[PDB]
CSV table of C-alpha atoms and ligand atoms in Angstrom, one decimal:
chain,number,residue,atom,x,y,z
R,6,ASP,CA,146.0,87.1,140.6
R,7,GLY,CA,145.2,90.7,139.6
R,8,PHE,CA,145.7,92.8,142.8
R,9,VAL,CA,144.9,89.9,145.3
R,10,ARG,CA,147.8,87.8,146.5
R,11,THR,CA,147.0,84.5,148.2
R,12,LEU,CA,149.3,84.0,151.2
R,13,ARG,CA,147.4,81.1,152.6
R,14,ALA,CA,144.4,79.9,150.7
R,15,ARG,CA,141.1,79.2,152.5
R,16,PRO,CA,139.7,75.7,152.3
R,17,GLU,CA,137.3,75.0,149.4
R,18,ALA,CA,134.5,75.3,152.0
R,19,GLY,CA,134.2,76.4,155.7
R,20,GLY,CA,137.3,77.1,157.7
R,21,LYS,CA,138.5,80.1,159.7
R,22,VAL,CA,137.9,83.7,159.0
R,23,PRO,CA,140.5,85.1,156.5
R,24,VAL,CA,142.8,87.9,157.4
R,25,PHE,CA,142.9,90.5,154.6
R,26,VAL,CA,146.2,92.4,154.6
R,27,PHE,CA,146.9,95.6,152.6
R,28,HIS,CA,150.3,96.5,151.0
R,29,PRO,CA,152.7,99.0,152.7
R,30,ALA,CA,154.0,102.1,151.0
R,31,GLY,CA,156.4,101.1,148.2
R,32,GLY,CA,156.1,97.4,148.9
R,33,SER,CA,153.9,94.3,148.5
R,34,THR,CA,152.0,92.0,150.8
R,35,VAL,CA,154.8,89.5,151.0
R,36,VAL,CA,155.9,91.5,154.0
R,37,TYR,CA,153.0,89.9,156.0
R,38,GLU,CA,154.6,86.5,155.9
R,39,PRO,CA,156.2,86.8,159.3
R,40,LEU,CA,152.9,87.9,160.8
R,41,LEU,CA,151.1,85.0,159.1
R,42,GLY,CA,153.6,82.7,160.9
R,43,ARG,CA,152.5,84.2,164.2
R,44,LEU,CA,148.7,83.7,163.5
R,45,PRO,CA,146.7,80.5,164.3
R,46,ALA,CA,147.2,77.4,162.1
R,47,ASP,CA,145.1,77.4,159.0
R,48,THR,CA,144.2,81.1,159.2
R,49,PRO,CA,143.7,82.1,155.6
R,50,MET,CA,145.4,85.3,154.4
R,51,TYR,CA,145.0,87.4,151.3
R,52,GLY,CA,146.9,90.5,150.4
R,53,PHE,CA,145.6,93.4,148.4
R,54,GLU,CA,148.3,95.0,146.3
R,55,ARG,CA,148.6,98.5,144.8
R,56,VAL,CA,145.9,100.1,142.7
R,57,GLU,CA,145.7,103.7,141.5
R,58,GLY,CA,143.8,106.7,142.8
R,59,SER,CA,143.1,108.6,146.0
R,60,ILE,CA,142.5,106.5,149.2
R,61,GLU,CA,138.7,106.6,148.5
R,62,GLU,CA,139.2,105.6,144.9
R,63,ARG,CA,141.4,102.7,145.9
R,64,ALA,CA,138.8,101.5,148.5
R,65,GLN,CA,136.2,101.7,145.7
R,66,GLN,CA,138.3,99.1,143.9
R,67,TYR,CA,139.0,96.9,146.9
R,68,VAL,CA,135.6,96.8,148.5
R,69,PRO,CA,133.8,94.9,145.7
R,70,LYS,CA,136.6,92.4,145.7
R,71,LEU,CA,136.4,92.0,149.5
R,72,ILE,CA,132.6,91.3,149.2
R,73,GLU,CA,133.1,88.8,146.3
R,74,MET,CA,135.6,86.9,148.5
R,75,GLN,CA,133.9,87.1,151.9
R,76,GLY,CA,130.3,88.2,151.4
R,77,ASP,CA,128.5,89.4,154.5
R,78,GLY,CA,131.5,88.9,156.8
R,79,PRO,CA,133.1,88.6,159.1
R,80,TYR,CA,135.8,90.9,157.9
R,81,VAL,CA,139.3,91.1,159.4
R,82,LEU,CA,141.3,93.9,157.8
R,83,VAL,CA,145.0,94.6,158.7
R,84,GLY,CA,147.7,96.8,157.4
R,85,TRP,CA,151.1,98.3,158.2
R,86,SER,CA,152.2,101.7,156.8
R,87,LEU,CA,149.8,102.7,154.0
R,88,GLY,CA,148.1,99.4,154.3
R,89,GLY,CA,146.6,100.4,157.6
R,90,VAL,CA,144.9,103.4,156.1
R,91,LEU,CA,143.7,101.3,153.2
R,92,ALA,CA,142.3,98.7,155.6
R,93,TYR,CA,140.6,101.5,157.6
R,94,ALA,CA,139.1,102.9,154.5
R,95,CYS,CA,137.8,99.5,153.4
R,96,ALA,CA,136.3,99.0,156.9
R,97,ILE,CA,134.3,102.2,156.5
R,98,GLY,CA,133.2,101.2,153.0
R,99,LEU,CA,132.1,97.7,154.1
R,100,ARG,CA,130.3,99.0,157.2
R,101,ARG,CA,128.4,101.5,155.1
R,102,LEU,CA,127.2,98.6,152.9
R,103,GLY,CA,125.9,96.7,156.0
R,104,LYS,CA,128.7,94.2,156.2
R,105,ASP,CA,130.1,92.8,159.5
R,106,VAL,CA,133.6,94.1,160.2
R,107,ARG,CA,135.0,92.5,163.3
R,108,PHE,CA,138.6,93.7,163.4
R,109,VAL,CA,140.7,96.5,162.0
R,110,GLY,CA,144.4,96.1,162.8
R,111,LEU,CA,146.7,99.1,162.1
R,112,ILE,CA,150.3,98.1,162.3
R,113,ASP,CA,152.0,101.4,163.3
R,114,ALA,CA,150.0,103.3,160.7
R,115,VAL,CA,150.7,106.5,162.6
R,116,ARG,CA,149.5,110.0,161.6
R,117,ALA,CA,152.0,112.9,161.7
R,118,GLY,CA,151.8,114.7,165.1
R,119,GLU,CA,150.8,117.9,163.4
R,120,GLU,CA,148.5,117.7,160.3
R,121,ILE,CA,150.4,118.1,157.0
R,122,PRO,CA,148.8,121.1,155.2
R,123,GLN,CA,147.7,120.6,151.6
R,124,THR,CA,148.5,124.2,150.6
R,125,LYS,CA,150.6,126.0,148.0
R,126,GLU,CA,152.8,127.3,150.7
R,127,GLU,CA,153.4,123.7,151.8
R,128,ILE,CA,154.0,122.5,148.3
R,129,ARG,CA,156.7,125.1,147.9
R,130,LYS,CA,158.4,124.4,151.3
R,131,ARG,CA,158.3,120.7,150.5
R,132,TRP,CA,160.0,121.0,147.1
R,133,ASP,CA,162.6,123.5,148.6
R,134,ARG,CA,163.4,120.8,151.1
R,135,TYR,CA,163.9,118.2,148.4
R,136,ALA,CA,166.0,120.5,146.3
R,137,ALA,CA,168.3,121.3,149.3
R,138,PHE,CA,168.8,117.6,150.0
R,139,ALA,CA,169.6,116.9,146.3
R,140,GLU,CA,172.2,119.8,146.4
R,141,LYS,CA,174.0,118.2,149.4
R,142,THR,CA,173.6,114.6,148.2
R,143,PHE,CA,174.6,115.1,144.6
R,144,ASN,CA,177.1,118.1,145.1
R,145,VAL,CA,174.9,120.2,142.7
R,146,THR,CA,173.3,123.6,142.5
R,147,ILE,CA,169.6,123.5,141.7
R,148,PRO,CA,168.2,126.6,140.0
R,149,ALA,CA,165.0,128.3,141.0
R,150,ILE,CA,162.1,125.8,141.4
R,151,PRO,CA,159.3,126.4,138.8
R,152,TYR,CA,156.8,126.7,141.7
R,153,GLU,CA,153.9,128.0,139.6
R,154,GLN,CA,154.0,125.0,137.2
R,155,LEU,CA,154.4,122.6,140.2
R,156,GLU,CA,151.7,124.1,142.3
R,157,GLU,CA,149.0,123.5,139.7
R,158,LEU,CA,149.9,119.8,139.5
R,159,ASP,CA,148.8,116.9,141.6
R,160,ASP,CA,151.3,114.5,143.2
R,161,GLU,CA,151.3,112.3,140.1
R,162,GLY,CA,151.9,115.2,137.7
R,163,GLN,CA,154.5,116.7,140.0
R,164,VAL,CA,156.6,113.6,139.7
R,165,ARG,CA,156.2,113.3,135.9
R,166,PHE,CA,157.3,117.0,135.6
R,167,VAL,CA,160.2,116.1,137.8
R,168,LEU,CA,161.0,112.9,135.9
R,169,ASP,CA,161.2,114.9,132.7
R,170,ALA,CA,164.3,116.6,134.0
R,171,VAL,CA,166.2,113.5,135.1
R,178,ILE,CA,167.4,105.8,134.6
R,179,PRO,CA,166.4,102.1,134.7
R,180,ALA,CA,162.6,101.4,134.4
R,181,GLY,CA,162.5,99.4,137.6
R,182,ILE,CA,164.0,102.3,139.7
R,183,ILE,CA,161.7,105.0,138.2
R,184,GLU,CA,158.8,102.6,138.8
R,185,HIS,CA,159.9,101.8,142.3
R,186,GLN,CA,160.6,105.5,143.2
R,187,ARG,CA,157.4,106.7,141.6
R,188,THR,CA,155.1,104.3,143.5
R,189,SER,CA,157.0,104.7,146.8
R,190,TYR,CA,156.7,108.5,146.6
R,191,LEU,CA,153.1,108.4,145.6
R,192,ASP,CA,152.2,105.7,148.2
R,193,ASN,CA,153.9,107.9,150.9
R,194,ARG,CA,152.1,111.1,149.7
R,195,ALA,CA,148.8,109.1,149.9
R,196,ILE,CA,149.5,108.6,153.6
R,197,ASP,CA,150.3,112.3,154.0
R,198,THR,CA,147.1,113.5,152.4
R,199,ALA,CA,144.7,110.9,153.7
R,200,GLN,CA,141.5,112.5,154.9
R,201,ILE,CA,140.5,110.3,157.8
R,202,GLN,CA,136.8,109.7,158.3
R,203,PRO,CA,135.1,108.5,161.5
R,204,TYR,CA,134.6,104.7,162.0
R,205,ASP,CA,132.3,103.3,164.7
R,206,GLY,CA,133.8,99.8,165.0
R,207,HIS,CA,136.8,98.4,166.9
R,208,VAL,CA,140.2,99.4,165.8
R,209,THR,CA,143.4,98.0,167.2
R,210,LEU,CA,146.5,100.2,166.7
R,211,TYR,CA,149.9,98.5,167.2
R,212,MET,CA,152.1,101.3,168.1
R,213,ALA,CA,155.9,101.5,167.7
R,214,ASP,CA,157.9,104.2,169.6
R,215,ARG,CA,158.9,106.3,166.6
R,216,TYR,CA,159.2,106.7,162.8
R,217,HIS,CA,162.7,105.8,161.5
R,218,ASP,CA,165.2,108.5,160.7
R,219,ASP,CA,164.7,108.5,156.9
R,220,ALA,CA,160.9,109.1,157.3
R,221,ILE,CA,161.6,112.1,159.6
R,222,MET,CA,164.2,113.6,157.3
R,223,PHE,CA,161.7,113.4,154.5
R,224,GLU,CA,158.8,115.0,156.5
R,225,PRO,CA,159.8,116.3,160.0
R,226,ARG,CA,156.2,116.3,161.2
R,227,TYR,CA,156.5,112.5,161.7
R,228,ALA,CA,159.1,113.2,164.4
R,229,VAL,CA,156.2,113.7,166.8
R,230,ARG,CA,153.5,111.1,167.6
R,231,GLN,CA,150.4,111.5,169.6
R,232,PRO,CA,149.6,108.7,172.1
R,233,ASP,CA,146.5,107.7,170.0
R,234,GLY,CA,148.6,107.9,166.8
R,235,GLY,CA,146.2,110.5,165.5
R,236,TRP,CA,143.2,108.1,165.4
R,237,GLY,CA,141.4,109.0,168.6
R,238,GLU,CA,139.1,111.8,167.3
R,239,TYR,CA,138.0,109.5,164.5
R,240,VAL,CA,137.7,106.2,166.4
R,241,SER,CA,135.9,106.0,169.8
R,242,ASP,CA,136.4,102.3,170.0
R,243,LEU,CA,140.2,102.4,169.9
R,244,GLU,CA,142.7,100.0,171.5
R,245,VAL,CA,146.4,100.8,171.4
R,246,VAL,CA,149.0,98.0,171.8
R,247,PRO,CA,152.4,99.4,172.3
R,248,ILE,CA,155.1,97.4,170.7
R,249,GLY,CA,158.2,99.7,170.9
R,250,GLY,CA,160.9,100.0,168.3
R,251,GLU,CA,160.7,101.9,165.0
R,252,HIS,CA,158.2,101.9,162.2
R,253,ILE,CA,160.3,99.8,159.8
R,254,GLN,CA,160.8,97.0,162.4
R,255,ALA,CA,157.1,96.8,163.4
R,256,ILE,CA,156.4,94.3,160.6
R,257,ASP,CA,159.3,92.0,161.2
R,258,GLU,CA,160.5,89.5,163.8
R,259,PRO,CA,160.9,89.8,166.8
R,260,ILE,CA,158.3,92.7,167.2
R,261,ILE,CA,155.8,91.0,165.0
R,262,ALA,CA,155.6,88.1,167.5
R,263,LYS,CA,153.9,90.5,169.9
R,264,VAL,CA,151.5,91.8,167.3
R,265,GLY,CA,150.8,88.2,166.3
R,266,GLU,CA,150.1,87.0,169.9
R,267,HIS,CA,147.7,89.8,170.4
R,268,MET,CA,146.0,89.5,167.1
R,269,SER,CA,145.7,85.7,167.5
R,270,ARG,CA,143.7,86.3,170.7
R,271,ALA,CA,141.3,88.6,168.8
R,272,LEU,CA,140.9,86.0,166.0
R,273,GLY,CA,140.2,83.3,168.6
R,274,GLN,CA,137.4,85.3,170.1
R,275,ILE,CA,135.9,85.9,166.6
R,276,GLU,CA,136.0,82.2,165.9
R,277,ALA,CA,134.4,81.6,169.3
R,278,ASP,CA,131.7,84.1,168.6
R,279,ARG,CA,130.7,82.3,165.4
R,280,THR,CA,131.0,78.9,167.1
V,1,5V8,C1,161.7,107.5,153.7
V,1,5V8,N1,161.0,108.2,152.7
V,1,5V8,C2,159.6,108.3,152.8
V,1,5V8,O1,159.1,107.8,153.7
V,1,5V8,C3,158.9,109.0,151.7
V,1,5V8,C4,159.1,108.8,150.3
V,1,5V8,C5,159.9,107.9,149.6
V,1,5V8,C6,160.3,108.2,148.3
V,1,5V8,C7,161.1,107.3,147.5
V,1,5V8,C8,161.4,106.1,148.0
V,1,5V8,O2,162.2,105.2,147.3
V,1,5V8,C9,161.0,105.7,149.3
V,1,5V8,C10,160.3,106.6,150.1
V,1,5V8,O3,158.3,109.7,149.7
V,1,5V8,C11,157.6,110.5,150.5
V,1,5V8,C12,156.7,111.5,150.3
V,1,5V8,C13,156.1,112.2,151.4
V,1,5V8,C14,156.5,111.9,152.7
V,1,5V8,O4,155.9,112.5,153.7
V,1,5V8,C15,157.4,110.8,152.9
V,1,5V8,C16,157.7,110.5,154.4
V,1,5V8,N2,156.8,109.3,154.8
V,1,5V8,C17,157.3,108.9,156.1
V,1,5V8,C18,156.4,107.7,156.6
V,1,5V8,C19,155.0,108.2,156.8
V,1,5V8,C20,154.5,108.6,155.5
V,1,5V8,C21,155.4,109.7,154.9
V,1,5V8,C22,158.0,110.1,151.9
């Protein structure tokens, strides 16, 4: 299927408006199966899996596919983790092309409480933190970090440089894509969007997330989306980021989202 996974196929003709879901960091759209079970019967669902590039470059790949599949609209775009940002970026692209986007659902796609700087000083502090965790984890001494060579490299190049030093192909492939998908969240440059966004908000990021990047230890009440989205609804769901996508918490998301879908179906009926 390329990068589109069919979770529930739309009928040959007619039917309900499909929900387009976007993969999480380091994972696939199979994670949306619990959600799908909490959505109305015969709600079609398609998942957009990983593609390469910056967020904008990824949306430039998704948007033509969205249009091929759904045309003028209506568009319902949903994502947890990185998927939320991808969904949001696609919403901007679709709106810019005159399409009708009716719903953007961010499932705990929460920004760091303080903006993560994209600076050399930050690149050094980041790699120093990693090196220190490796020292403790692997009972090793890491020599001086070749900062100068690292600083000049993008995220992709940084991991290749690192993967020269150090393994089964599946693990390198899984670690590489997880790291890069997570950095993609970190460095996302949010643009403003004038349509409705629903943010399902958990209480906090899980411990591993925070150990990796302590700025995710703090969340703003709007999840960092308020300056960019004037039409913003927050649906608190509690719990941690990791749990937001699974039962039982997904039942709450599903109930709320089902109501939104019902109104959309009513509005076209
Ligand atoms: C739990 N580890 C992670 O979350 C991160 C990984 C990673 C690497 C390998 C793997 O197998 C699984 C994950 O690489 C990252 C890079 C930057 C970063 O800021 C983070 C933190 N992350 C927290 C959620 C909001 C987005 C940022 C991570």
